[PDB]
Write a protein that binds this DNA or RNA. Structure first.
Ligand SMILES: [Zn+2]
Ligand SMILES: [Zn+2]
Ligand SMILES: [Zn+2]
Lengths: 364, 1168, 115
RNA sequence: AAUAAU
């Protein structure tokens, strides 16, 4: 059966590292079928982000419960992919052969958030009922409490994991203390459902995307609870608010078929807009290694790969996935990408292999 | 916590080359630069390169170019450093250094457009007309630097041209245009070799006319259908004009007024290029990583991947419209990183991963044949190092406490892959030792074989007649009633002169001609036919060989101040202008005065010589001075002066009736903390130079390469005297006295080349050396090597296989076949029939010598050799590995081959449950990372039983243990820390770095009680972690906290520790991936803090090459700078005494204390 | 060869001292946790830990024989109270279900004991 | 034994 192993590519890259100082010494991989061993992980080919446009299809991972997948997340080491379905199930799939391992019952209500702490230790979640739970790397629940009284749509850890922020349909963003599990402050002011929250990598911001057209995106202060700024970016219902790990850009994705790259340092000037989604853009995933490259999951199922600086899309698979995509998670190496879908399924995509007539149904 | 970084071996391996007018406009020079070094070479006509000048930068060069600015007398150098730095440097006569003309910073945060990770290197270009310049900064900004010497530059937002240029591949300055025209090869819509069915051909070329005055840059001659795989582009010279694009499987010629002309090379372009391409005949190659250059307007030389050299001709009609191409496979050569056509008939093939060699071509009787004239030694990428003890050590030196070691490196790659047997010091092969008491000074004369040997005692003098048998004499012919002050060869190795306090005697051999009576003589130097003797009160007398018979001629000298020393010189190569004889001289007041011997007119003067100025220009307590010509035909003189237990050595360069010469000091690491101290040997194993006696003996060698080399003789302690030797039983060799009065007849070991900075031997394996391990029992090295073979099968899964069948114009991928050799230290030749041939695709991921426990040996450990392999068959075939534990045994040697007494014994080999990506031992166990886990096995008789396994990360690739703690390392995530409790078979994670990091290697920084984990980074950073459970950032030791930081200028992949020659601290040596070797020596808080002040003063109040900053260079990638910079701190020793005192008083410490702190870091770092 | 020139057996390290005394080890929160991969308590083995249930490290008992098959996979929730052995000794592994009941063992890399 | 083979 299919088995995408990154060990050959990591060993080849470890071999090349010794005598190749950059890409300028990398011998050209040729578009021939007999060049299977010339690949390296995206870490090797760094100034050609084109390689990690994962358009090859590996396998479709489905459960026997058949419930829509609202969140997919890779274990910090990549050993397995966890899948938060709409029934509370935590299906775990292998990280090398993408095969079923174990199915749990974490939450009574649909899972909507799943964030692995900035260290491997902890894995927060959240469900439609507002409950928040703590998990260990052995999938053992450690503590549970009700954070909000309405469905939590996202939860994001701080640079140091002592605090995390959550957003609910109640229209407020709350900031909690990790160990004490006690709310600190309610960041009120949006006035309607909040659909995303992302804690800035370092500076300690809390951005949020809301369903209200008046203040679609707001900037908060974790400590004082103020409202540092407001942004009228999109027309309606910002679906995903993600921050780049470099701490400069904020990429949104709204229900107006658009994704906009913003510079947090300069909110007055719109930096870039990504046209090309035929329907609502409901998912985003920055690349773990390539800063600038990201995927995008439309509400029509389309899956597009973008880059910062290029006017047009780098290249994706329209109709990559039935239903509407909910979340996308790159493998920690970056050579695989799992896409959650409203169609009770998730799919694994990997980089193309040199020397293939790209006649697949997701390609041509 | 605290440390100091010292550099042991300077990086080897060039990166850029050019043939410019560096020194003057008359003769051109080859300027080659590595990473942080610049070398200016010459050509001496056998054709041998000669080094002219070398300079070190506080940065890593990323490009190089030259310009003949308006009105200049030289060629300016447009160096470029990382993150948009442009430095225009120039040679400086009168200081023999690189002065700086204009340094441009472009590190504004708004120029990067919000990209933190920079993956683009600056690329500097110039017009062939010398009118302009450019620089591609961050891959989107183009710094146009107009030339009239400079004009206010400006920045072109390349993304805001008439057409936005993205993913620029290569840019060149074109020929034969009215305004500086720039070609841009770029990909508006990037693609990947593995994704070419939806983006077939994505490339373009655009030419923009740079209007300097009006700052307008229109667009002309755009093309938009080039094949996607376009690696570079070259501008054809003026007579033809245009540009050639070097596609991977194609070659194009483009001009604006004519249609394109492209020819394919190999039939891998059938469906990957819709560009109209011909089919080249009789050629199948790949221009993917290939240097190139133009012999003339018509022919260019290409050096592909693999080193093959071609000579392409641009067949053209009378209209100069290129009509056809013509290749021909000329003589193959090294893997080249650069190339430049030096002379009309010469070429240079620079290389980093292999020796860089100069060529020479001649017409065949349209067709050329390439020979080789010279090569540059290159310790290529140091993949590994296995410290071991030298096979041969003299039984005389076997009784020393300090260990004697050597390091064997896996240098080079591919056809140039080899091993490098690096050593630091000189180890004489003592042939015979004579216990002679009292005598301290000696001289070996010639009567070429050394007929005699004169020894000096307190009261008497005995002479040894060397030859068939060395035996003391008893008859007349020499003075024996008193000590001898000098005895050497006058005439031409045909007469004997010995100097005694009562006079000077001239001997024809055994017999004596006559005695010339004469403040007892204290020093004498002879330059044939001139003999000069200096008395105790400073008097100087001159003697000439007037026919033979020495003649008296009192030199006319006005002694304003007494003469303290004096030296005699005889220049054969004309550099002391206005053979000739010069009498260097040092006066009491501090003035040095080169004189003229035939006449005696003053010819030089320096006001304060003992101070140690970094350059000497015309108009304390110096003890000995020696000026001697070193190099080919004795071309470049050097001045060596011994002042105040400190050695400073001046070079010599010319500069315009006083002497048209000047002397410049050269860096140094020798601390000296009447018997001469500088001994000149003309031929010792084919080498010429000076031996520097005293507390730290050192050997000064410089070959026809002209580069100075200093080598220590630490073994046997200090050296009193020294002398060259050539006997029937003893070939060209030396003879020195020991501190214990032990005369030692010696000969230099013949298997080492003392031309490199460190005595090295290159063992060409002709394959890729991957690992190396030393087995302590049987004292032999193992080596893992790989050779490339065409791949004719594609592994698949269902196992099955598919055969690769194509047409005759097909390029076969290079599959790697692995094998483990066994290199005998005795002769450095692989052991026949002792080789392990691994499976077809098995790639040796790791190999180390492992001390598994055993009961047969008296100790608790045995010391087998352990390896871990892995079947690489693409990302679709499951990856599995094998642990191979081999023991080297002894067998009765086969007659005629004494080296076949060793043979690998395969105790264990089994297919594990995953790739064996790393290996190590812990207190007699075997720890191995098999996939997502680390196991811990116990050595049974012939099996391995598992003890304790834990899950770590994606890919562990480097493990190491101390007593019970295992320091794993991940390719992406971080280092870890695991602890084995022996009482209960449990492996526990003590701590773990919480931040992502691309690690290269790991080791241990060992202090008395605290233990730091030295880690190497992809970005060339060295940092030390710690496990401190009582800090706040680390909750209970859960996090590892960085306590030191340093940005080394090179990638480091291997470490090893050696105790300081400091109670319980160990040095942590490393070898960088560009041929360098450095240290990391721990230090005390007081020492570090009192040397940080000196470091800050050096950074601030000193001018640096190219105007760079030392402090900014060493900042990591937040920064905790607890590692001093021994390379920058070394410049404090370079400074004069006056500047040292000024800087010391400025920072608030005394110069003597600062020196004591600086010199101990060299005393305790004199291993190997 | 590394242990001959530079030996680390006569040096008492601050790291050794720290891990010996469980220095700076704050009691873990949420009594219901497992904390797999943690060393065994060096104090509970001699007299007593004094932080029963709250100990950062592991408290062991000499009763279990069969190796926990879930611990091998890396997901067992019982942890410190696991009713099955928690070491890599591959001689008390569970008997192969397919071999014992459903004929033979389909996979040739099975670690479960065959009887 | 809690999904070892979904
Ligand atoms: Zn305890
Ligand atoms: Zn268990
Ligand atoms: Zn079985």
């Amino acid at each position: 059966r299919k088995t995408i192993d990154y060990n050959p590519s990591v060993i080849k890259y470890l071999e090349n590292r010794i005598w190749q100082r950059d890409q300028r010494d990398m011998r050209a991989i040729q578009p021939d079928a007999g060049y299977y061993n010339d690949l390296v992980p995206p870490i090797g080919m760094l100034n050609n982000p084109m390689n990690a446009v994962t358009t090859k299809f590996v396998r479709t991972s489905t459960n026997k419960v058949k419930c829509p997948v609202f969140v997919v997340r890779w274990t910090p080491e990549g050993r397995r992919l966890v899948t938060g379905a709409s029934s509370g199930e935590f299906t775990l799939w292998n990280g090398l052969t993408f095969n079923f391992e174990t199915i749990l019952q974490a939450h009574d209500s649909p899972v909507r958030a799943m964030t692995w702490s900035h260290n491997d230790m902890w894995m927060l979640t959240a469900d439609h009922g507002g409950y928040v739970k703590y998990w260990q790397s052995n999938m053992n629940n450690v503590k549970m409490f009700q954070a909000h009284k309405e469905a939590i749509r996202e939860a994001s850890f701080s640079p140091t994991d002592n605090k995390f922020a959550t957003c609910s349909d109640d229209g407020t963003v709350r900031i909690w203390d990790f160990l004490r599990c006690h709310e600190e402050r309610i960041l009120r002011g949006h006035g309607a459902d909040v659909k995303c929250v992302d804690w800035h990598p370092t500076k300690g911001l809390v951005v949020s995307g809301s369903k209200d057209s008046q203040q679609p995106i707001k900037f908060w202060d974790p400590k004082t609870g103020q409202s540092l700024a407001t942004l009228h970016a999109h027309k309606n219902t910002v679906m995903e608010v993600k921050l780049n790990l470099n701490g400069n850009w904020l990429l949104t994705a709204s229900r107006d078929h658009l994704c906009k790259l913003f510079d947090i340092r300069n909110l007055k000037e719109e930096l870039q807009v990504f046209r090309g989604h035929k329907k609502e853009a409901t998912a985003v995933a920055w690349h773990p290694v390539h800063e600038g490259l990201f995927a995008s999951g439309g509400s029509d199922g389309s899956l597009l790969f973008w880059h910062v600086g290029v006017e047009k899309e780098v290249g994706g698979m329209e109709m990559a996935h039935e239903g509407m995509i909910w979340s996308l998670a790159w493998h920690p190496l970056g050579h695989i990408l799992c896409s959650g879908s409203n169609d009770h399924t998730s799919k694994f995509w990997t980089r193309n292999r040199p020397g293939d007539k790209m006649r697949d149904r997701y390609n041509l | 916590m605290y440390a100091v970084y010292k550099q042991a071996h300077p990086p080897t391996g060039l990166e850029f080359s050019m043939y410019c007018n560096f020194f003057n406009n008359s003769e051109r020079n080859l300027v080659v630069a590595g990473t942080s070094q610049l070398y200016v070479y010459r050509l001496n006509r056998r054709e041998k390169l000669e080094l002219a000048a070398s300079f070190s930068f506080f940065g890593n060069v990323m490009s190089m170019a030259s310009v003949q600015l308006a009105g200049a007398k030289r060629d300016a150098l447009l160096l470029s450093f990382k993150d948009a730095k442009l430095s225009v440097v120039e040679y400086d006569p009168g200081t023999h250094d690189l002065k700086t003309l204009s340094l441009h910073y472009f590190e504004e945060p708004e120029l990067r457009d919000g990209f933190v990770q920079n993956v683009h290197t600056p690329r500097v270009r110039v017009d062939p007309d010398g009118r302009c310049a450019a620089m591609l900064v961050y891959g989107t900004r183009l710094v146009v630097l107009p030339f009239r010497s400079f004009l206010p530059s400006y920045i072109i937002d390349v993304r805001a041209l008439d057409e936005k240029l993205l993913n620029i591949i290569d840019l060149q300055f074109l020929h034969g245009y009215y305004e500086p025209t720039l070609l841009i090869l770029f990909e508006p819509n990037q693609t990947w070799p593995g994704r070419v069915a939806v983006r077939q051909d994505t490339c373009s070329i655009v030419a923009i006319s740079l209007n300097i005055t009006q700052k307008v840059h229109p667009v002309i001659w755009s093309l938009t259908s080039l094949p996607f795989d376009c690696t570079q582009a070259l501008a054809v010279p003026k007579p033809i004009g245009g540009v050639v694009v070097f596609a991977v499987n194609s070659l194009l010629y483009l001009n604006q007024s004519v249609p394109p002309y492209g020819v394919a090379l190999n039939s891998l372009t059938t469906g990957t290029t819709a560009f109209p391409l011909r089919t080249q005949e009789g050629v199948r190659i790949t221009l993917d990583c290939a240097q190139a250059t133009f012999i003339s307007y018509d022919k260019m030389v290409i050096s592909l991947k693999g080193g093959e050299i071609y000579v392409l001709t641009l067949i053209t009609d009378g209209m100069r419209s290129v009509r056809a191409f013509h290749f021909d496979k000329a003589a193959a050569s090294v893997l080249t990183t650069s190339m430049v056509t030096m002379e009309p008939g010469y070429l240079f093939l620079g290389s980093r991963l292999g020796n860089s060699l100069l060529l020479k071509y001649t017409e065949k009787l349209a067709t050329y044949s390439f020979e080789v004239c010279d090569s540059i030694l290159n310790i290529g990428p140091c993949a590994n190092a296995a410290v071991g003890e030298p096979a041969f050590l003299s039984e005389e030196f076997q009784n020393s406490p300090e260990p004697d070691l050597e390091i064997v490196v896996c240098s080079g790659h591919g056809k140039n892959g080899a091993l490098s047997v690096l050593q630091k010091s000189i180890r004489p092969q003592v042939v015979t030792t004579f216990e002679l008491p009292g005598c301290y000074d000696m001289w070996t004369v010639i009567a070429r074989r050394h007929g005699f040997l004169i020894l000096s005692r307190e009261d008497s003098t005995m002479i040894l007649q060397t030859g068939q048998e060395i035996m003391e004499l008893d008859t007349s012919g020499f003075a024996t009633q008193g000590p001898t002050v000098f005895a050497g060869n006058i005439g031409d190795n045909r007469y004997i002169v010995q100097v005694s306090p009562l006079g000077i005697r001239l001997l024809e051999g055994v017999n004596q001609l006559h005695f010339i009576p004469v403040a007892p003589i204290v020093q004498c130097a002879v330059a044939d036919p001139y003999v000069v003797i200096m008395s105790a009160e400073g008097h100087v007398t001159m003697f000439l060989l007037k026919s033979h018979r020495l003649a008296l001629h009192k030199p006319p000298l006005h002694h304003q101040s007494k003469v303290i020393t004096l030296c005699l010189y005889r220049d054969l190569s004309g550099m002391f202008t206005t053979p000739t004889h010069w009498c260097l001289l040092v006066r009491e007041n501090g003035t040095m005065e080169i004189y003229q011997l035939p006449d005696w007119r003053l010819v030089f003067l320096v006001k304060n010589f003992p101070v140690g100025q970094r350059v000497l220009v015309d108009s304390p307590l110096v003890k000995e001075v020696l000026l001697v010509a070193l190099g080919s035909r004795q071309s470049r003189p050097y001045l060596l002066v011994h002042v105040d237990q400190e050695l400073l050595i001046y070079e010599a360069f010319p500069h315009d009736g006083n002497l048209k010469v000047r002397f410049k000091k050269v860096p140094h690491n020798i601390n000296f903390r009447r018997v001469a101290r500088f001994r000149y040997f003309e031929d010792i194993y084919g080498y010429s130079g000076v031996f520097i006696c005293g507390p730290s003996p050192h050997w000064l060698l410089v070959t026809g390469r002209g580069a100075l080399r200093l080598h220590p003789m630490a073994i046997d302690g200090p050296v009193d005297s020294f002398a060259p030797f050539h006997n029937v039983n003893c070939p060209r060799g030396f003879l020195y006295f020991n501190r214990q009065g032990e005369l030692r007849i010696s000969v230099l070991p013949a298997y080492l080349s003392y031309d490199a900075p460190w005595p090295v031997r290159k063992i060409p394996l002709r394959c890729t050396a991957h690992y190396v391990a030393y087995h302590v029992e049987s004292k032999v090295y193992a080596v893992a090597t790989s050779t490339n073979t065409p791949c004719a099968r594609i592994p698949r899964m269902t196992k099955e296989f598919e055969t690769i069948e194509r047409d005759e114009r097909y390029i076969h991928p290079q599959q790697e076949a692995f094998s483990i050799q066994l290199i005998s230290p005795v002769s450095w030749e692989a052991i026949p029939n002792a080789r392990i041939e691994l499976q077809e695709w098995e790639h040796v991921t790791c190999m180390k010598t492992v001390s598994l426990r055993s009961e047969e040996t008296v100790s608790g450990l045995k010391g087998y050799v352990a390896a871990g392999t892995c079947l690489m068959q693409g990302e679709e075939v499951t990856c599995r590995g094998r642990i191979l534990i081999m023991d080297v045994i002894e067998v009765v040697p086969e007659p005629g081959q004494p080296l076949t007494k060793n043979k690998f014994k395969v105790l264990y080999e089994k297919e594990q449950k995953g790739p064996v990506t790393a290996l190590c031992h812990c207190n007699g166990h075997l720890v191995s990372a098999i996939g997502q886990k680390i196991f811990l096995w116990s050595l049974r008789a012939s099996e391995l039983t598992g003890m304790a396994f834990i899950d770590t990360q994606l890919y562990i690739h480097q493990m190491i243990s101390v007593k019970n703690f295992i320091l794993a390392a991940d390719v992406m995530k971080s280092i870890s820390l695991l602890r084995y409790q022996e009482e209960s078979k449990t492996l526990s994670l003590v701590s773990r770095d919480a931040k992502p990091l691309e690690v290269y290697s790991v080791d241990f920084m060992v202090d008395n009680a605290q233990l730091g984990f030295l880690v190497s980074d992809r970005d060339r950073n060295l940092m030390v972690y710690m496990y401190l459970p009582e800090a706040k950032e680390s909750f209970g030791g859960m996090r590892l906290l960085r306590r030191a930081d340093f940005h080394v200028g090179a990638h480091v992949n291997t470490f090893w520790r050696t105790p300081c020659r400091w109670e319980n601290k160990h040095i942590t040596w490393f070898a960088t991936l560009d041929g360098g070797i450095g240290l990391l020596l721990p230090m005390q808080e007081k020492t570090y803090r009192r040397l940080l002040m000196l470091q800050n003063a050096l950074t601030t109040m000193l001018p640096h090459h190219a105007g760079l900053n030392p402090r900014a260079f060493r900042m990591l990638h937040n920064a905790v700078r607890n590692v001093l910079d021994g390379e920058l701190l070394n410049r404090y020793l370079y400074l004069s005494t006056m500047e040292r005192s000024e800087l010391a008083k400025k920072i608030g410490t005394t110069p003597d204390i600062i020196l004591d702190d600086l010199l101990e870091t060299d005393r305790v770092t004199a291993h190997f | 060869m590394q242990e001959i020139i530079a030996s680390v057996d006569h040096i008492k390290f601050d790291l050794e001292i720290a891990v010996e005394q469980q220095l700076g080890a704050q009691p873990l929160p949420f009594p219901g946790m497992d904390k797999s991969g943690a060393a065994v308590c060096e104090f509970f083995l001699k007299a007593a830990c004094g932080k029963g249930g709250m100990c950062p490290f592991r408290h062991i008992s000499g009763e279990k024989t069969v190796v926990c098959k879930h611990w091998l996979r890396g997901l067992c929730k019982k942890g410190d109270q696991c009713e099955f052995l928690h070491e890599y000794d591959m001689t008390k592994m569970p008997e192969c279900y397919f071999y014992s009941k459903f004929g033979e063992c389909s996979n040739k890399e099975c670690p479960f004991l065959h009887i």
